[PDB]
């Protein structure tokens, strides 16, 4: 209804204006509107900081020195404005990001800019998304955002991926396990149990099975190990990508 929504808009404007809500008799439509004009004629940096933890900075394109840096650089990077002022962007950025920096600060070919780089805060670097334009200078806002080891196998059981924690859990280099089947490192008694687990994980697609067997270490001792595994499915084709195992000692 037109009258119902318009009246609801008027009474909501009553509730928002303090000098109008404090009144006892709700004034007529002409009065509240004039009282609202007077309220507004009497009276977003934090919105960006609240939304994405971003800070504005203006840098020179040729030298790289900053010509402005907002105070929001302290909440986002724990760095004073004096630390940024009088310095170049190349100092506040990871050493392996200066080549990328130049290609974004080069006004030879260009304008908009968008890039990611690691900035120093506090030798700790944080990932910052920098979006801005050219005005030379760049006006941009930068915003913020061993008991086991995980392995991946094909359906047969061939290591196709091994994380570095294997060198501590079993003592093998990742290259030692890769290319070979997991049952080759299994005790012959428990070998049939391991193949049975690999038969179920495929059959119980998506479900998590758990087998416990003796794993041959590089020192050639049988370390008891619980391997909890499950099949990984492609979110589109539902093809079994691999079998993800988390092999935990004892």
């Amino acid at each position: 209804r037109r009258r119902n929504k318009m009246t609801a808009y008027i009474t909501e404007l009553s509730d928002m204006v303090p000098t109008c809500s404090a009144l006892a008799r709700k004034p007529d439509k002409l009065t509240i509107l004039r009282m609202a004009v007077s309220h507004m004629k009497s009276l977003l940096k934090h919105l960006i900081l609240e939304a994405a933890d971003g800070f504005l900075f203006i840098v020179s394109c040729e030298t790289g020195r900053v010509v402005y840096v907002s105070d929001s650089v302290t909440p986002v990077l724990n760095q004073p404005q004096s630390e940024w002022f009088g310095s170049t962007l190349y100092d506040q950025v990871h050493p392996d990001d200066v080549d990328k920096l130049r290609e974004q600060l080069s006004t030879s070919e260009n304008s908009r800019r968008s890039f990611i780089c690691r900035m120093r805060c506090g030798p700790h670097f944080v990932v910052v998304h920098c979006t801005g334009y050219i005005k030379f200078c760049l006006v941009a806002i930068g915003r913020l955002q061993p008991t086991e080891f995980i392995s991946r196998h094909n359906i047969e059981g061939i290591f196709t991926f091994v994380d570095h924690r294997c060198v501590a859990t079993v003592g093998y280099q990742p290259q030692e396990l890769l290319g070979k089947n997991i049952v080759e490192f299994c005790h012959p008694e428990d070998q049939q149990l391991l193949r049975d687990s690999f038969q179920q994980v495929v059959k119980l697609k998506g479900q998590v099975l758990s087998v416990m067997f003796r794993f041959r270490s590089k020192t050639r001792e049988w370390l008891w190990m619980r391997t909890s595994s499950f099949t990984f499915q492609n979110p589109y084709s539902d093809e079994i990508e691999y079998i993800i195992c988390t092999n935990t000692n004892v």
Partner: protein, 293 residues
């Protein structure tokens, strides 16, 4: 009557060209939305507007708990065709894809306050910079990252960034970035040459391979969601993920994936991906996959 209603339009934070032209109900809506936004700004806070609003690749949205978009940044027009006056005060569900309304709702509530999602909004502008009528409205995917904040009610204050289409792109492309084409199961069907100079793979030896085999296992979950989003909305931006390098080690990457539709039969043809190399080869001595041997 008209003269006093014409006065509030002048006093709204708008240019006189667009404010002196709306109806009375729109003036009331905009006034109420501005007052609620100021009431919230008094809570969050204990010229240079051009620099902040122009250097943004997105728009700021302050949406109430019931879905009322009490604040929308001006640049929203630049990204959506629908401008500030036409959308401020209206419900977010009246201008968003219904298949995303449940996720929008579960992101509007509530004890973590950070929010990061992808949502499809009505877009009535074309790549030629020409605005189109609302009836011809496409669905534009927006990565919305923000916070939920309680004040006096609850509000979602987010920055919504569009994901640039790889065909219609206008941003210096760093030499530390490379393009790749995939099938819908994310298998390589084409790759750029720079992958040889950045990660070490030759573009031939990646074709027909599942990309699920070339990244670190610790990222496996965080990738699936991306794929699903990329398959559900047609566009996604992944997080920082480690792609296993050729001769050992891994490289940090952030990828913007876009579902490309065939222009003649309107069927999904492939998925185009712009990958931003975020570091050099880390742990290059350590091998992880069988392909690193």
């Amino acid at each position: 009557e008209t003269e006093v209603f014409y006065e509030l339009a002048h006093e709204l934070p708008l240019p006189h060209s667009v404010s002196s032209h709306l109806d009375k109900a729109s003036i009331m809506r905009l006034a109420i939305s501005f007052l609620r936004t100021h009431k919230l700004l008094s809570s969050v806070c204990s010229q240079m507007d051009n620099l902040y609003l122009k250097a943004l690749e997105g728009f700021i949205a302050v949406v109430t708990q019931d879905g009322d978009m009490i604040f929308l940044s001006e640049n929203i027009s630049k990204f959506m065709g629908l401008t500030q006056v036409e959308l401020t005060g209206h419900s977010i569900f009246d201008f968003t894809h219904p298949c995303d309304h449940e996720e929008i709702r579960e992101n509007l509530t509530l004890v973590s306050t950070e929010r990061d999602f992808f949502m499809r909004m009505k877009c009535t502008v074309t790549n030629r910079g020409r605005t189109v009528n609302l009836k011809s409205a496409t669905w534009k995917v927006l990565h919305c990252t923000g916070q939920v904040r309680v004040y006096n009610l609850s509000c979602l204050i987010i920055m919504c960034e569009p994901i640039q289409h790889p065909s219609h792109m206008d941003i210096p492309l760093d030499s530390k970035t490379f393009l790749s084409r995939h099938s819908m199961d994310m298998k390589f069907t084409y790759c750029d040459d720079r992958i040889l100079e950045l990660i070490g793979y030759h573009p031939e030896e990646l074709l027909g391979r599942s990309a699920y085999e070339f990244y670190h296992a610790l990222d496996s979950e965080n990738m699936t969601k991306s794929h699903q989003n990329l398959c559900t909305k047609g566009q996604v931006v992944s997080g920082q993920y480690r792609m296993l390098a050729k001769h050992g080690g891994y490289v940090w990457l952030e990828t913007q994936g876009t579902v490309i539709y065939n222009p003649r039969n309107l069927q999904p043809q492939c998925i185009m991906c712009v990958n931003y190399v975020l570091s050099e080869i880390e742990k290059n001595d350590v091998v992880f996959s069988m392909d690193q041997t």
